[PDB]
Design an enzyme around this catalytic site. Structure first.
Site, PDB file in Angstrom:
ATOM      1  CB  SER A 118      -0.959   0.006   1.199  1.00 47.64           C
ATOM      2  OG  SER A 118      -1.846   1.114   1.142  1.00 47.64           O
ATOM      3  CG  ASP A 135      -3.287   3.993  -0.936  1.00 44.51           C
ATOM      4  OD1 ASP A 135      -4.051   3.982  -1.915  1.00 44.51           O
ATOM      5  OD2 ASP A 135      -3.391   3.165  -0.005  1.00 44.51           O
ATOM      6  CG  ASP A 165      -2.999  -0.402  -2.111  1.00 47.20           C
ATOM      7  OD1 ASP A 165      -3.025   0.743  -1.612  1.00 47.20           O
ATOM      8  OD2 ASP A 165      -3.404  -1.389  -1.469  1.00 47.20           O
ATOM      9  CG  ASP A 187      -6.651   0.444  -0.747  1.00 46.76           C
ATOM     10  OD1 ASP A 187      -5.808   1.361  -0.623  1.00 46.76           O
ATOM     11  OD2 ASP A 187      -6.631  -0.604  -0.055  1.00 46.76           O
TER      12      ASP A 187
HETATM   13 MG   LIG Z   1      -3.882   1.298   0.174  1.00 48.97          MG
END
Ligand SMILES: [Mg+2]
Ligand SMILES: O=P(O)(O)O[C@@]1(CF)O[C@H](CO)[C@@H](O)[C@H](O)[C@H]1O
Length: 448
Positions: A97, A237, A239, A241
Site C-alpha cells: 500500500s 496511495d 495501491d 484503494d
Molecule cells: Mg492502500
C-alpha cells in the site's frame, strides 16, 4: 513468538526477514486449504519485489490444485473486483500500500471478495504456515494470464452519466504508484483535462513513498492545482484503494466530509438506501444522509466490519473518515476510483466547486482531524480522560472504543487495530473555539 507479518487485516512486513518468497509460497498452500472450490485471482502493485512474491504465491496455490488467474499489475480494488466478477474462490493482492520501500505484504479475500482477517482465516493461515516444514510440491494446476481491464473500466464508468460531465481540469497524483495506469485508460472516455503529477509507476519511488498524508506529497498535489487553475485535485496511495481530494484553492479536504458528500451523490441514484459510517466522526454524515432520504447505519471502523455491516443491511454505500469508500455494486468493496468519478459528476451537475460543496458542512461540524497518541499506558490515559469529564454526564457509546456526546461537542477515543496507538477525533456543533479548547484539553489529559 508468531510471524510478525500477520496483522489483524492483512500481511505486511519487511522483505526478506518478515516476508519472502518461501513464506509467500507457504501462504499459497495454506490459503488453498481455506477456500471453497474455484480458482484464485492474483495481482500485485509496483513494488520491486511484488512480482516475485506473486509468483511464489502462485506456485504454492498451484501445487495445491488451485488454478490461478493472474491479473497482473493492478490496484487492490481490481483484485476485489475480479475475484467477485470472475466468481473466483478468492484472491490475493501483493502490496504494501503506502509503506516504505523495503516492505511488502498481501491482502487476502475469499468468495465475493469477502475479507480474510485475523479471526476469519488469516491467523489460521499464519499458524499453518508457521508449522509447515513440508517440501514444496509441484504444480498440479495452471496459471492463466487475464490482464484485460475492460469489465473493470466499464463498471467504474457506470457510476456516472457521461453526458452530464463537464470538461473539468483535474490534477491527478499517483505518487508513482499504480493509479495513473487506470486514469489513462479511463481518459479516452471522459471529457476531463488531466494534469498528471508523479504519474509514472516506479517502485523506486523517486518522489517519496506513495502516502498522500505526508505533507510533501500533499504539497505536490496542492501546488499543481493552484498553478494550473484546476477544478480539484486527487491523490492516491500506492495501491489506490484510498483517494484524497484537494479543492480549487489547494486545500486538502478532510475525509470525514467526503462521506456525507458521496452518500448524497449515491442516494440520488439509489433513493432510500442505507449508508454505513464509522463512529469516529458522525454528526455531519447522519444529517446529510437523512437529508438525502437515506438511512444511516453506525458501524465499528475497519474495512471488514464496514463490509460485513453493509452486506447485512444491503447498504448502497459505506464510508470511513480515513479515506475508504465502499460500494454495494462493487462487491461491497472499497475503490479509490469510484469516489472521484462521483465527485467530478457532482461538480459538473451542480455547477458548484468542491470547495463550496463542503464549505458549509465544515463550518457546521468542524472536526479536529484524527490525532494519534503513543503513550506509556493507553488504558490509564483513557481512564484519565473519562474521569475528568464524568461530572458532565456525557452520553457514552462503546461501538468502537469510547464515544462521548456532550450535546454541543463529542469525541471518539479508540485503540488502533493496525498500530499500537490511541486515536482521537473531536467534533462540535458549529463552534471552532469549543473544538480547539476541548481537543487541547483531551490531548493534555492523554499525555499526562
Ligand atoms: Mg492502500
Ligand atoms: O485506525 P486503524 O489503525 O484501526 O485502521 C485504519 C488505519 F488507517 O485502517 C483500516 C483499514 O485500512 C481502516 O478501515 C480504518 O478506518 C483505518 O482507521
Amino acid at each position: 513468538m508468531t510471524l510478525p507479518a500477520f496483522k489483524a487485516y492483512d500481511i505486511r512486513g519487511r522483505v526478506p526477514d518478515e516476508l519472502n518468497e518461501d513464506l509467500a509460497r507457504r501462504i499459497g498452500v495454506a490459503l488453498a486449504a481455506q477456500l471453497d472450490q474455484g480458482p484464485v485471482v492474483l495481482g500485485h502493485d509496483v513494488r520491486l519485489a511484488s512480482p516475485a512474491l506473486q509468483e511464489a504465491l502462485s506456485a504454492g496455490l498451484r501445487a495445491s490444485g488451485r488454478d490461478v488467474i493472474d491479473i497482473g499489475l493492478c490496484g487492490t480494488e481490481e483484485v476485489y473486483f475480479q475475484t467477485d466478477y470472475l466468481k473466483a474462490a478468492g484472491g490475493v493482492m501483493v502490496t504494501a500500500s503506502h509503506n516504505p520501500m523495503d516492505y511488502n505484504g498481501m491482502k487476502l479475500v475469499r468468495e465475493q471478495a469477502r475479507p480474510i482477517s485475523s479471526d476469519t482465516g488469516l491467523f489460521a493461515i499464519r499458524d499453518t504456515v508457521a508449522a509447515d516444514t513440508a517440501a514444496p510440491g509441484e504444480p498440479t494446476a495452471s496459471e492463466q494470464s487475464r490482464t484485460d481491464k475492460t469489465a473493470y473500466l466499464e463498471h467504474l464508468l457506470s457510476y456516472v452519466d457521461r453526458s452530464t460531465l463537464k470538461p473539468l481540469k483535474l490534477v491527478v497524483n499517483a505518487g508513482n504508484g499504480g493509479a495513473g495506469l487506470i486514469v489513462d485508460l479511463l481518459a479516452p472516455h471522459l471529457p476531463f483535462e488531466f494534469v498528471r503529477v508523479f504519474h509514472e509507476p516506479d517502485g523506486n519511488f523517486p518522489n517519496g513513498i506513495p502516502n498522500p498524508l505526508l505533507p510533501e506529497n500533499r504539497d505536490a498535489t496542492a501546488k499543481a492545482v493552484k498553478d494550473n487553475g484546476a477544478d480539484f485535485g486527487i491523490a492516491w496511495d500506492g495501491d489506490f484503494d484510498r483517494c484524497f481530494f484537494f479543492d480549487h484553492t489547494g486545500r486538502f479536504i478532510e475525509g470525514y466530509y467526503l462521506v456525507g458528500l458521496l452518500a448524497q451523490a449515491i442516494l440520488a441514484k439509489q433513493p432510500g438506501g442505507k449508508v454505513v459510517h464509522d463512529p469516529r466522526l458522525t454528526w455531519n454524515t447522519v444529517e446529510q444522509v437523512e437529508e438525502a432520504g437515506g438511512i444511516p447505519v453506525l458501524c465499528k471502523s475497519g474495512h471488514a466490519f464496514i463490509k460485513e455491516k453493509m452486506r447485512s443491511e444491503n447498504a448502497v454505500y459505506g464510508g470511513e473518515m480515513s479515506a475508504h469508500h465502499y460500494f454495494r455494486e462493487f462487491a461491497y468493496a472499497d475503490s479509490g476510483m469510484i469516489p472521484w468519478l462521483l465527485i467530478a459528476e457532482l461538480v459538473s451537475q451542480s455547477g458548484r466547486s468542491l470547495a463550496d460543496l463542503v464549505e458549509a458542512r465544515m463550518q457546521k461540524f468542524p472536526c479536529s482531524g484524527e490525532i494519534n497518541f503513543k503513550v506509556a499506558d493507553a488504558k490509564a490515559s483513557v481512564a484519565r480522560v473519562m474521569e475528568h469529564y464524568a461530572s458532565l454526564s456525557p452520553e457514552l457509546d462503546y461501538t468502537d472504543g469510547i464515544s462521548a456526546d456532550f450535546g454541543q461537542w463529542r469525541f471518539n477515543l479508540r485503540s488502533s487495530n493496525t498500530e499500537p496507538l490511541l486515536r482521537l477525533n473531536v467534533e462540535t456543533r458549529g463552534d471552532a473555539a469549543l473544538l480547539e479548547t476541548r481537543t487541547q484539553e483531551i490531548s493534555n489529559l492523554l499525555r499526562g
